[PDB]
Structures are given as C-alpha cells and as structure tokens.
Amino acid sequence: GNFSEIESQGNISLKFGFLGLGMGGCAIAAECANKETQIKNNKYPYRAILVNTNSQDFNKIEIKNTGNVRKIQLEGYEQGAARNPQVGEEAFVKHETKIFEAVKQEFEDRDFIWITCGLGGGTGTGALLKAIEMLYEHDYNFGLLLTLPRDAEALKVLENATSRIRSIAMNQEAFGSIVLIDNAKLYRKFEEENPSALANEYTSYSNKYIADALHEINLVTSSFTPFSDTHFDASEFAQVINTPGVLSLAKLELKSNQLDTENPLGYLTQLGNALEKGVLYDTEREELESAKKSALSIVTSPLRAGRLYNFSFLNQMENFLKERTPYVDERPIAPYVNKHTTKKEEDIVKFYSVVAGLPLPKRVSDIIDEITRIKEEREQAN
Ligand SMILES: Nc1nc2c(ncn2[C@@H]2O[C@H](COP(=O)(O)OP(=O)(O)O)[C@@H](O)[C@H]2O)c(=O)[nH]1
C-alpha cells in the first residue's frame, strides 16, 4: 500500500483520530496512527489513544508515530482470557476521567474520531458503549471502526460480538458511520491471494489492509483534479462518514480497454460485483437499495480522461448508481484526472465508492446462526 506518489502531490480530506479499545482495536488504531505519508508538512496525519488492560501484547503494540499515539492503561482490570464484557465496561468507567483527559488533549485538532474495536473480546467490547457515550456526551464527531469475529473464535466471542452489534444498530442514530470489517472475509481474502502464506502473516496484513483502505479513500477525495463540476471532495466525504448506519467501501481498477462505453455490460458488471464484494465486508443489492447516501469517484490519466468522461460513460454511471442506491439523498458521480499519472499507469481507470446508512450485513446473521447451531445441538446432545 504505497501511496507515496499520490501523497506527494495530494492531501487527506479529514484529520482522523482513532480511539482504540481492547487488543484488536488498539492494534488497528495504532496501525492507522503510525502511518507515514509524503504529504507536504504532514508526515503523520493521524492520531490515536489506545485504551487497553496491561499485557505483554499491549506492550508489544509497537508505536512509530511518537506523541501522536498515547497508550492509556486500564490498571486493575486485566482480564486474561475471560472474554467478559462486563469487566471491560467497569474498567472504562473507573478510568473515564483519565481517558477523557487524554482524548481531550490528543484529539483537539481532529475532524472525526473512529472508536476502533474488535468485537468479541472482553475489554474492547465491554468498553465500547461507554466510549460511545463519552464521545457523544462531549459532542465529538465520531463513528465506529469494528471487526466481526471468525467462526473458529467460538461461542463466547461470537455471543459477545452479537450482543454489542445489536445494541449498536438500535442506537445508531446517535453517531456517525459504522465501518464494519468482516474478519472471516479478510481471512479468506488472504488465503486466496496468498495460498502459500503462513498464519504468521495474517494479523499484520489485515491491519495494514484496513488502515490502507481508510487512508486511501481519505486521500482520493482531496488529491486529484476534478474533471467537472460534480465533486466528491472533503466536504462530501465528511457528510458521508457522519451518516448513521453501516458504511461500505468499494474499489475497482480496470485497464482502459476493458471499459467499453459502446458495450457497457462488461465493465458495469465488474463494478457491480466490486460494490457487493466490498473492501472490508460483503454486501448485497438488497442492502444497498436502502442506502441513505452514496458517492462514486473515477480517476484516470490526462491521456484517458478526456476520451472516457463523455456523455455516454457519465450517463451509464449515473444509471448504475441510481439502480444500486435508488433512494439516496444525493449520489454524485465524480470524475477526476490524476494529472501526475505515470506513463506506466496511463491506461488504468480506478473506481472508488462509498455507500452509507446501510443495514447490518449478512455476516451478522450468519454469526447468530452459528451461535444458534451450537446451543441447539448442545440441547439435543443433552
Ligand atoms: N483485524 C483484526 N482483528 C483483531 C485483532 N486482534 C483481535 N481482533 C478481533 O477482535 C476480537 C477481540 O479480540 P481482542 O481485541 O484481543 O479482545 P479484548 O482485548 O478483550 O478487547 C477478536 O475476536 C478478533 O476477532 C487484530 O490485530 N486485527
């Protein structure tokens, strides 16, 4: 995930802060906060506060971005493998004053905060609702960056996740977007693109993959030259990220010759598949249909832009999004020119979309059925 070229000539739309809770949430938050960029006068664009109980692992969470990443240790509530949310909850409440003082100072210059948490654990999951109340009570603009557990994590972790996800959705109107991450999906993605990969490379891969997906859309929305008057800029991006409900990201890269405007079915089908098989989780038409907001940006070279962004293409794209998110407040189709595209990448056309205000995905229901299976077979066994 090297965005050096783009960063040296671009910028990020929003100054994100990450409030990590628990091991996984802190690992993801740290991965994002430690990102180094080639952005003018902004080597380290992100900040983070990592809240977790003491442990060797938590001590192990590196930290490159100095000063912009602070660890807050939940003294006295180390939980071990108890996987008990009630304890995580008590921990957060007990240390709330210390935590908020840290949040207050570190996030003063932030535009938006991501409460980052791996659903299923004790500390993170347990502290989640309290953390949300804290940011809400102090009027921060914030959203949730959450992972859903793999089936192998078993019963307790799945119930822990199911419990919070349910409560989150019920109270979703109280805050911004919920960027869901399906660990099962990403685990599979890893195996497939790295068949000969070993288990020791997954965690790093998934955390970098997540951080890169968020940073990339943050970059794309403020680093290129708009071809027209329709934009998906920092302002619009903020509008979308602040929309309640689940948020889905998609990205498709095609070679210029695979994008036929006289025979659009081919590339429109690929775009449709990219939107459903999203970056962080998998969605479907039924879910997309109820989107509250959506935006799609297209980026290509000076060489290709002029010939691509014609009436036919733009109209086909307008139609495409209209069929996918029919009831959206606004769905801009925003073509961009990357004026500094290399000769080597001259033919590439990139598509980026963000869909917001979505319902919980199918993976949440599959987890419920996995929990249901286990409990019912346990009864039959009895
Ligand atoms: N993507 C990702 N997910 C993680 C990571 N660590 C843990 N998780 C997930 O988050 C869930 C909770 O684990 P953890 O954060 O360690 O528990 P906690 O410290 O008690 O909150 C697990 O069930 C995993 O699915 C990580 O480094 N990356």
From Swiss-Prot:
Recount the UniProt induction comment for this entry.
Expression is repressed by upstream TubR (at protein level). Probably part of the tubR-tubZ operon.
Pfam families membership: Tubulin, TubZ_C
Q: Which reaction does it catalyse?
A: GTP + H2O = GDP + phosphate + H(+)
The entry's GTP-binding residues are M23, G24, G122, T123, G124, E153, N183, S206, N207
Keyword rRNA processing in annotation: no
Top EC class, one word: hydrolase
SMART domains referenced in this protein's UniProt entry, alphabetically: Tubulin
What molecular function does GO assign, one term? GTPase activity
Entry EC no(s): 3.6.5.-
Subcellular location field: Cytoplasm
Residues folding into a coiled coil are none
Assembly and oligomerization: Forms filaments. Filaments bind to TubR. Binds to the TubR-tubC protein DNA complex.
User: Its function?
Assistant: A tubulin-like, filament forming GTPase; the motor component of the type III plasmid partition system which ensures correct segregation of the pBc10987 plasmid. Binds GTP and forms filaments. The filaments seed from a DNA centromere-like site (tubC)-TubR complex which extends to surround the TubZ filaments. Highly dynamic filaments grow at the plus end and depolymerize at the minus end, a process called treadmilling. TubR-tubC complexes track the depolymerizing minus end of the filament, probably pulling plasmid within the cell.
Q: What is this protein called?
A: Tubulin-like protein TubZ
Q: Which organism is it from?
A: Bacillus cereus (strain ATCC 10987 / NRS 248)
The gene for this chain is tubZ
